[PDB]
Homo-oligomer: A and B are copies of this chain.
Amino acid sequence: VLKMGRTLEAISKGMSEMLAKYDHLVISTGRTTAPAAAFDAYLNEHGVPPPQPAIFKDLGVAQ
Assembly stoichiometry (copies): 4
Q: Please, which residue of chain B has its CB at the minimum distance from the CB of A14?
A: B15
Contact in complex: A27, B21 (CB < 8 Å): yes
- Choose from B10, B21, B33, B52 the contact partner of A12 (Cβ within 8 Å): B10
Interface residues contributed by chain A, number (CB under 8 Å)? 48
On whether the beta carbons of A25 and B33 are closer than 8 Å, the reply is yes
Partner of A23, one of B18, B34, B52: B18
Contact of A24 among B15, B53, B58 (CB under 8 A): B58
Tell me which residues across on chain B come within 8 A of A36, comparing CB atoms: 24-28, 31-32
Instruction: Give A contacts to B, CB under 8 Å.
Output: 1, 3-5, 7-12, 14-19, 21-37, 39-40, 50-62
